[PDB]
mmCIF file of all heavy atoms in Angstrom:
data_model
loop_
_atom_site.group_PDB
_atom_site.id
_atom_site.type_symbol
_atom_site.label_atom_id
_atom_site.label_comp_id
_atom_site.label_asym_id
_atom_site.label_seq_id
_atom_site.Cartn_x
_atom_site.Cartn_y
_atom_site.Cartn_z
ATOM 1 N N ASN A 137 31.061 8.601 12.480
ATOM 2 C CA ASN A 137 30.707 7.214 12.167
ATOM 3 C C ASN A 137 32.026 6.391 12.067
ATOM 4 O O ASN A 137 32.892 6.701 11.323
ATOM 5 C CB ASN A 137 30.157 7.172 10.655
ATOM 6 C CG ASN A 137 28.699 7.710 10.752
ATOM 7 O OD1 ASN A 137 27.805 7.062 10.277
ATOM 8 N ND2 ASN A 137 28.464 8.865 11.327
ATOM 9 N N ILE A 138 32.083 5.370 12.948
ATOM 10 C CA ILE A 138 33.189 4.477 12.971
ATOM 11 C C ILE A 138 32.772 2.976 12.683
ATOM 12 O O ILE A 138 31.858 2.494 13.386
ATOM 13 C CB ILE A 138 33.786 4.554 14.460
ATOM 14 C CG1 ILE A 138 34.427 5.870 14.643
ATOM 15 C CG2 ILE A 138 34.885 3.414 14.620
ATOM 16 C CD1 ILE A 138 34.348 6.448 16.056
ATOM 17 N N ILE A 139 33.435 2.404 11.650
ATOM 18 C CA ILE A 139 33.015 1.071 11.120
ATOM 19 C C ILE A 139 34.120 0.225 11.367
ATOM 20 O O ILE A 139 35.312 0.389 11.022
ATOM 21 C CB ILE A 139 32.754 1.106 9.593
ATOM 22 C CG1 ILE A 139 32.040 2.482 9.092
ATOM 23 C CG2 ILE A 139 32.061 -0.044 9.179
ATOM 24 C CD1 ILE A 139 30.725 2.636 9.705
ATOM 25 N N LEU A 140 33.799 -0.924 12.176
ATOM 26 C CA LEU A 140 34.788 -2.099 12.337
ATOM 27 C C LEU A 140 34.745 -3.016 11.026
ATOM 28 O O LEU A 140 33.695 -3.453 10.654
ATOM 29 C CB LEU A 140 34.298 -2.860 13.518
ATOM 30 C CG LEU A 140 34.597 -2.208 14.880
ATOM 31 C CD1 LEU A 140 33.594 -2.575 15.901
ATOM 32 C CD2 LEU A 140 36.100 -2.637 15.253
ATOM 33 N N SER A 141 35.924 -3.220 10.561
ATOM 34 C CA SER A 141 36.094 -4.194 9.564
ATOM 35 C C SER A 141 37.579 -4.663 9.613
ATOM 36 O O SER A 141 38.443 -3.867 9.907
ATOM 37 C CB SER A 141 35.936 -3.721 8.162
ATOM 38 O OG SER A 141 36.188 -4.650 7.154
ATOM 39 N N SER A 142 37.793 -6.039 9.395
ATOM 40 C CA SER A 142 39.208 -6.494 9.408
ATOM 41 C C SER A 142 39.847 -6.045 8.009
ATOM 42 O O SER A 142 41.075 -6.250 8.032
ATOM 43 C CB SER A 142 39.261 -7.934 9.526
ATOM 44 O OG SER A 142 38.614 -8.599 8.460
ATOM 45 N N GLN A 143 39.103 -5.547 7.134
ATOM 46 C CA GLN A 143 39.639 -5.282 5.796
ATOM 47 C C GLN A 143 39.781 -3.778 5.558
ATOM 48 O O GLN A 143 39.107 -3.004 6.179
ATOM 49 C CB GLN A 143 38.636 -5.856 4.654
ATOM 50 C CG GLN A 143 38.503 -7.389 4.772
ATOM 51 C CD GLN A 143 39.862 -8.084 4.886
ATOM 52 O OE1 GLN A 143 40.678 -7.889 4.028
ATOM 53 N NE2 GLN A 143 40.053 -8.851 5.908
ATOM 54 N N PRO A 144 40.487 -3.270 4.587
ATOM 55 C CA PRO A 144 40.518 -1.912 4.338
ATOM 56 C C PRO A 144 39.190 -1.198 4.085
ATOM 57 O O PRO A 144 38.321 -1.813 3.505
ATOM 58 C CB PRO A 144 41.529 -1.710 3.132
ATOM 59 C CG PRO A 144 42.364 -2.902 3.129
ATOM 60 C CD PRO A 144 41.449 -4.026 3.719
ATOM 61 N N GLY A 145 39.102 -0.031 4.498
ATOM 62 C CA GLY A 145 37.821 0.731 4.333
ATOM 63 C C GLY A 145 37.531 0.985 2.848
ATOM 64 O O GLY A 145 38.338 0.977 2.027
ATOM 65 N N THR A 146 36.179 1.157 2.603
ATOM 66 C CA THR A 146 35.735 1.157 1.246
ATOM 67 C C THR A 146 34.780 2.451 1.068
ATOM 68 O O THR A 146 34.073 2.508 0.110
ATOM 69 C CB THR A 146 34.978 -0.030 0.799
ATOM 70 O OG1 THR A 146 33.937 -0.288 1.719
ATOM 71 C CG2 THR A 146 35.917 -1.233 0.792
ATOM 72 N N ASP A 147 34.898 3.375 1.994
ATOM 73 C CA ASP A 147 34.108 4.662 1.890
ATOM 74 C C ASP A 147 34.862 5.677 2.698
ATOM 75 O O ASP A 147 35.028 5.625 3.886
ATOM 76 C CB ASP A 147 32.730 4.447 2.467
ATOM 77 C CG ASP A 147 31.766 5.486 1.995
ATOM 78 O OD1 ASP A 147 32.020 6.716 2.271
ATOM 79 O OD2 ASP A 147 30.742 5.221 1.337
ATOM 80 N N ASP A 148 35.269 6.775 1.993
ATOM 81 C CA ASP A 148 36.090 7.875 2.504
ATOM 82 C C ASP A 148 35.287 8.617 3.552
ATOM 83 O O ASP A 148 35.903 9.424 4.345
ATOM 84 C CB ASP A 148 36.512 8.863 1.504
ATOM 85 C CG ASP A 148 37.715 8.198 0.613
ATOM 86 O OD1 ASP A 148 38.127 7.069 0.873
ATOM 87 O OD2 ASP A 148 38.147 8.914 -0.322
#
Side-chain angles (χ1 to χ4, degrees):
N137 287 227
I138 291 143
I139 322 293
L140 284 148
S141 174
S142 64
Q143 301 311 305
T146 57
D147 199 301
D148 287 357

